[PDB]
Ligand binder design. Structure first.
Ligand code: HEM
Length: 184
């Protein structure tokens, strides 16, 4: 179960975050033990497509090679805080698992600037019992976390030393699919 009401960034700039471009997860923190593997790759695109607020996600386990994409329309709870009902799709946007009630994630942007961000998500998926996940994002897949975002991790009362890096997994991303998925 999730336990955090994450606080959105004061003065969050939604148009800059949701500009159609790609964010890479460089470091993550799962609050519950063994919720997720200790080696993992993930990225997203975020933008408005034909007036609709969207995200496209990519997950890849670099050991098992398990891979999946998702597309969601985000609904607004408050500035920087969203609820997303997801559909699993192939990289071209063809539906593999349709939107269904009870399959949704919340998504809070705790900190963002033009290059980096800190987000929280609570995933709900059928009768999985998952816990809070925080992720440091960057526009550059290889970027070490700078002081702006590390300070935000501290301000959230978290220890950056506990976050697991994704950088030693040889992650390669299909940015073109992520951007085109925003329309799907
Ligand atoms: C960018 C932030 C992230 C978001 C918004 C997110 C969202 C999601 C969503 C929506 C699903 C279910 C997809 C589906 O079934 O169609 C999922 C599943 C999963 N995610 Fe993430 N994820 C993020 C980052 C990560 C990271 C960094 C990890 C590290 C391991 C991770 C591990 C997983 C795993 C293992 C599953 C499979 C869950 C299961 O079915 O048991 N995710 N995530």
């Amino acid at each position: 179960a999730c336990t955090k009401n994450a606080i959105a960034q004061t003065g969050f700039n939604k148009d800059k975050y949701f500009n159609g471009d790609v964010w890479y997860v460089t470091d993550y923190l799962n609050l519950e033990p063994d919720d997720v593997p200790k080696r993992y790759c993930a990225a997203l695109a975020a933008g408005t497509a034909s007036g609709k607020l969207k995200e496209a996600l990519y997950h890849y386990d670099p050991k098992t090679q398990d891979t999946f994409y998702d597309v969601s329309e985000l609904q607004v709870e408050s500035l920087g805080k969203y609820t997303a009902n997801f559909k699993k799709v192939d990289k071209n946007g063809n539906v593999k698992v349709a939107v269904t009630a009870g399959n949704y994630y919340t998504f809070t942007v705790m900190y963002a600037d033009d290059s980096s961000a800190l987000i929280h998500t609570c995933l709900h998926k059928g009768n999985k019992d998952l816990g809070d996940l925080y992720a440091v994002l960057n526009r550059n897949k290889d970027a070490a976390a700078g002081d702006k975002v590390k300070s935000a991790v501290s301000a959230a009362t978290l220890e950056f030393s506990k976050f697991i890096s994704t950088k030693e997994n040889n992650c390669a991303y299909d940015n073109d699919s992520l951007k085109s998925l925003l329309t799907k």
